[PDB]
C-alpha cells in the first residue's frame, strides 16, 4: 500500500535525521542538542537543589552530650531541693 508505505517512510525518515543521525533538525531553526542533553541535562537539578540535595550531604550528626559530667554541685542542690519538695510533699 503506497499510501501506507510512503506515509510511514516519511513518518520514520523525517525524524530519522533528528534521532538516528545527529544532523540536528533541518526544519527547526532552533537547535535540539543544547536543550535536553546540555542545558536541561542539569534539568532535574535545576528543578531540585544542586550541591546539597543531589550531592545529598552525607553529614555527620552534631554530637550532643550528657550533663557536662558534673554530679556534685548539682546533685547536692537536687537533694536539698528534694528536701524542699518533700516538705511540700
Amino acid at each position: 500500500q503506497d499510501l501506507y508505505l510512503r506515509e510511514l517512510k516519511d513518518t520514520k525518515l523525517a525524524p530519522s535525521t533528528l534521532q538516528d543521525a545527529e544532523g540536528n533538525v533541518k526544519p527547526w531553526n532552533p537547535p535540539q542538542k543544547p536543550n535536553l542533553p546540555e542545558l536541561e541535562l542539569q534539568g532535574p537539578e535545576a528543578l531540585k537543589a544542586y550541591t546539597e540535595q543531589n550531592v545529598e550531604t552525607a553529614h555527620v550528626a552534631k554530637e550532643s552530650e550528657e550533663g557536662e559530667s558534673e554530679p556534685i554541685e548539682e546533685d547536692w542542690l537536687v537533694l536539698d531541693d528534694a528536701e524542699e519538695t518533700k516538705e511540700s510533699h
Binding site: 500500500q1 499510501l3 501506507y4 506515509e7 513518518t11
Partner: protein, 188 residues
C-alpha cells in the same frame, strides 16, 4: 410482500401506488407514466413546479390535475387517481420526491444497485471501467441485477477514493488514513 421500504413519510403514497399497481404488473407502464408526468411538469417548469403550492384551492388543484390529463395521455392507469387523491390530499408539492422514490423502487426491481466511487477529482475511464466490473462480478451484486456507478468530486476529502453501495463501503483514501496517522501518534 412489499419491496424495499420507503419507510413512512410520504413515500407511502409511492409505496401504496406501487404495491396496488404491481398486483397486476403495469408498473413499467405506470412507471413510464410517472416519468412522463414528471417530464411534463419539468417541460412546463413555470407553474408546473410553481403550481404545486398549497394556497390555491381544492377545485383549482383538481383543475390542474385536469390540465395534466388534458395534455394528451400523460396520465395512465392508477396514476391519475393517485393525483386525484394527491390533489385532494394537497400533497402535490412533495410530488418530485414520490417520482424519484418510485424510480428507486423500480430500478431496485431491476436490481440496479447504484454505487459510487467518491474522489476529490474526476478520474480516467480505465479506472472507472476496471472498478465497474470488479463490484459487478463481486459477491456484492449477485448477478441477474445490474450495477451503475458514479464518480463524484469531494473537496472535503483529501483525495484517494471510496467505494459505496448497499450501505456497504470501503475507504482506502488519504484523509481517513492521515486521521488514523494522527490518532496513533496522539498517544504517549
Amino acid at each position: 410482500p412489499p419491496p424495499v421500504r420507503l419507510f413512512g413519510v410520504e413515500g407511502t403514497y409511492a409505496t401504496a401506488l406501487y404495491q396496488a399497481a404491481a398486483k397486476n404488473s403495469s408498473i413499467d407502464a405506470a412507471f413510464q407514466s410517472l416519468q412522463k408526468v414528471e417530464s411534463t411538469v419539468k417541460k412546463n417548469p413555470k407553474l408546473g413546479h410553481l403550481l404545486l403550492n398549497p394556497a390555491l384551492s381544492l377545485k383549482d388543484r383538481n383543475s390542474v390535475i385536469d390540465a395534466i390529463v388534458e395534455t394528451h395521455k400523460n396520465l395512465d392507469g392508477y396514476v391519475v387517481n393517485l393525483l386525484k387523491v394527491l390533489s385532494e390530499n394537497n400533497r402535490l408539492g412533495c410530488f418530485e420526491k414520490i417520482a424519484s422514490d418510485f424510480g428507486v423502487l423500480n430500478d431496485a426491481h431491476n436490481g440496479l444497485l447504484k454505487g459510487t466511487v467518491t474522489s476529490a477529482e474526476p478520474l480516467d475511464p480505465k479506472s472507472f471501467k476496471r472498478i465497474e466490473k470488479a463490484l459487478s462480478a463481486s459477491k456484492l451484486v449477485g448477478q441477474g441485477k445490474s450495477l451503475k456507478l458514479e464518480n463524484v468530486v469531494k473537496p472535503e476529502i483529501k483525495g484517494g477514493l471510496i467505494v459505496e453501495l448497499g450501505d456497504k463501503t470501503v475507504d482506502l483514501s488519504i484523509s481517513t488514513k492521515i486521521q488514523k496517522l494522527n490518532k496513533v501518534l496522539e498517544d504517549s
